[PDB]
Design a binder for this molecule. Structure first.
Ligand code: FE
Length: 52
């Protein structure tokens, strides 16, 4: 599934992995990630990402 890049720090959210230790089990798409989710390495919200 399509990956999103964190505009602030460049961290790339990967659907094929998700963000396990923050509730987002793997295989999850980006529309599908918990609205409250923030970038794990710099805090930015979902609104600050862009399709990679
Ligand atoms: Fe970030």
């Amino acid at each position: 599934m399509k990956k999103y890049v964190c505009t602030v720090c460049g961290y790339e959210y990967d659907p094929a992995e998700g963000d396990p230790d923050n509730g987002v089990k793997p295989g999850t798409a980006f529309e599908d990630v918990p609205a409250d989710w923030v970038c794990p390495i710099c805090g930015a919200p979902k609104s600050e990402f862009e399709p990679a």
